[PDB]
């Protein structure tokens, strides 16, 4: 699974390898699986893109993908 911002928004990619750790493959491990292309941010925003396990992705400013 890859988080596509919208072709008419941007072109950045947050690719989620499901059901795997981040060793068999901006690194964060979900219960869904390993995530690349997004940086972990402790402070919480409103959910925009569903992936799973209480984790969501949005775009906050320089523009980059956040988990």
């Amino acid at each position: 699974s890859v988080i596509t911002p919208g072709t008419n928004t941007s072109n950045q990619v947050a690719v989620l390898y499901q059901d795997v750790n981040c060793t068999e493959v901006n690194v964060f491990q979900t219960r869904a699986g390993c995530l690349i292309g997004a940086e972990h941010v402790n402070n919480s925003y409103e959910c925009d893109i569903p992936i799973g396990a209480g984790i969501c992705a949005s775009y906050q400013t320089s523009q980059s993908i956040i988990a």
Binding site: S1, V2, I3, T4, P5, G6, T7, N8, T9, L16, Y17, Q18, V20, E24, D48, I49, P50, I51
Partner: peptide, 16 residues
């Protein structure tokens, strides 16, 4: 589609 809206979509399958 050449245009894609904002969301999460399945593309392919991962294998070892």
């Amino acid at each position: 589609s050449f245009t894609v809206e904002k969301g999460i979509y399945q593309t392919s399958n991962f294998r070892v």
